């Protein structure tokens, strides 16, 4: 069945316990979250941009993480389901290198996750998020936007940054599940991939992309 298309190459070699949340979830230790979250800056600390927008390092829990465009990733490096965001959340499963779905839990060395993304409406999704084998959240998408501006607090925008550039909307710059610097798409594995969002509030929202209406739940802070 289609659960067999989940790459399940998981190895808790760092002794964190992270595989528990794939089952008996609700045990997260949020003590280190304030230190991790202090590395994320509110949008107001970035420089205003202007001029024509063109297309362009870690901590994927910050909204302003600037990802690389999605490609094809070996299934041996993935643990659990891959979610991509249209912005509505969709699951991408294992295939062979030619795109035929495969049903061996990603254990075959030819198995891959073809995440190659082109922004909707002409494409498939804005970005993707998954967990790698040792429990680190990985994300890809966009590519994010260079909005101009001067100084060392210049913003590569991977979400809706309207306040810093009028044209840097999510349709233009979205690169993953961050709808705005304060909101990310809610989905069954959000708490596993983004555990420090545990206390975010859940809002019913609507987004329009090329005139297609998306009704989704957003988790906001």
């Amino acid at each position, epitope marked *: 069945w289609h*659960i*067999n298309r989940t790459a*399940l*190459n*998981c*190895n*808790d*070699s*760092l*002794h*964190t*316990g*992270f*595989l*528990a*949340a*794939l*089952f*008996y*979830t609700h*045990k*997260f*230790n949020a003590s280190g979250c304030p230190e991790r979250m202090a590395h994320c800056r509110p949008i107001d600390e970035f420089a205003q941009g202007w001029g024509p927008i063109t297309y362009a390092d870690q901590r994927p829990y910050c909204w302003h993480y600037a990802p690389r465009q999605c490609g094809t990733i070996p299934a041996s490096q993935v*643990c659990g389901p891959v979610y991509c965001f249209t912005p509505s959340p969709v699951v991408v499963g294992t295939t062979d290198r030619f795109g035929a779905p495969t049903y*061996t*839990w990603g*254990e075959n060395e030819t198995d891959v996750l073809i995440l190659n993304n082109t922004r909707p409406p002409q494409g498939n999704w804005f970005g993707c998020t998954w967990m790698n084998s040792t*429990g680190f959240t990985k994300t890809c998408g966009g590519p994010p936007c260079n909005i101009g501006g001067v100084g060392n607090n210049t913003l590569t925008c991977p979400t809706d940054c309207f306040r810093k550039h009028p044209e840097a909307t999510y349709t233009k710059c979205g690169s993953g599940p961050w709808l705005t610097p304060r909101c990310l798409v809610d989905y069954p594995y959000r708490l596993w991939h983004y*555990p420090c969002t545990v206390n975010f509030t859940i809002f019913k929202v609507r987004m329009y992309v090329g005139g297609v209406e998306h009704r989704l739940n957003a988790a906001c802070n």
Partner: antibody, heavy 125, light 108 residues
């Protein structure tokens, strides 16, 4: 990085009680089961009981009925083992043990075991 | 579930291969058979879990195999630090039980 930190060595008279503690540390997701196993000088390993932190549910062996009491303090992530009416042959190193998922392969995941460093309890007059 | 280890004492030289057996009275899933090393005065050190999965940090020369009622721990090339007591351990049934130990000593 998971480390189970037990309390230090203890000496008690026969008939008394001892309370051994085991503090969970370094977890990102805290395990739900803690077992106690003991090893007397020069002997093998013997399972005593288990506490489930979710329920407070405890299961023990009938060799220690009435004397063994296991509790969980959720605010300090510390499990306690209390053994009452001590006899000299309760002299042993007492270990807390907590299973944890180590890896997955072909749709099924497999538990490994994190061990505390042991607590020596010596019972003597 | 009684676990019976054999032999009680293995007298080998460094570089030789060691093979330790564990036999259970009833059947246990591979899923829940662990092997430990224990040195005098120290705590048991986990070597393999799930019968055949080496714990992280454990050198490659240690490997576990078997299923059902019969399980094996192999050290391919004994090193000086490997002479110790070894225990098997079934944890499939919440009432855990352990083997009685195999001592691996130096032959001379």
């Amino acid at each position: 990085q998971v480390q189970l930190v037990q309390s230090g060595a203890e000496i008690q008279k026969p008939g008394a009680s001892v309370k051994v503690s085991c503090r969970a540390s370094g977890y990102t997701y805290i395990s739900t089961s803690f077992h106690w196993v003991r090893q007397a000088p020069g002997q093998g390993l013997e399972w005593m009981g288990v506490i489930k932190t979710d329920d407070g549910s405890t299961s023990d062996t009938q060799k220690f009925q009435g004397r063994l009491r296991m509790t969980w303090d959720t605010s300090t992530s510390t499990v306690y083992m209390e053994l009452s009416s001590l006899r000299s042959d309760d002299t042993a190193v007492y270990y807390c043990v907590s299973p944890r998922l180590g890896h997955c392969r072909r749709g099924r995941c497999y538990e490994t075991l994190d061990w505390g460093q042991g607590s020596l309890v010596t019972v003597s007059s | 579930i009684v676990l019976t280890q054999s032999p009680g004492t293995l007298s080998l030289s460094p570089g030789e291969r060691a093979t330790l057996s564990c036999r259970a009275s009833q059947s246990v899933s591979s899923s829940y058979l662990a092997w430990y090393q224990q040195k005098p005065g120290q705590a048991p050190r986990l070597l393999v879990y799930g019968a055949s999965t080496r714990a992280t940090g454990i050198p490659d020369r240690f490997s576990g195999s078997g299923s059902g009622t019969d399980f094996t721990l192999t050290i391919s090339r004994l090193e000086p630090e490997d002479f110790a007591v070894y225990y098997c351990h079934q944890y499939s049934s919440s009432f855990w039980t352990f083997g009685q130990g195999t001592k691996v000593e130096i032959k001379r």
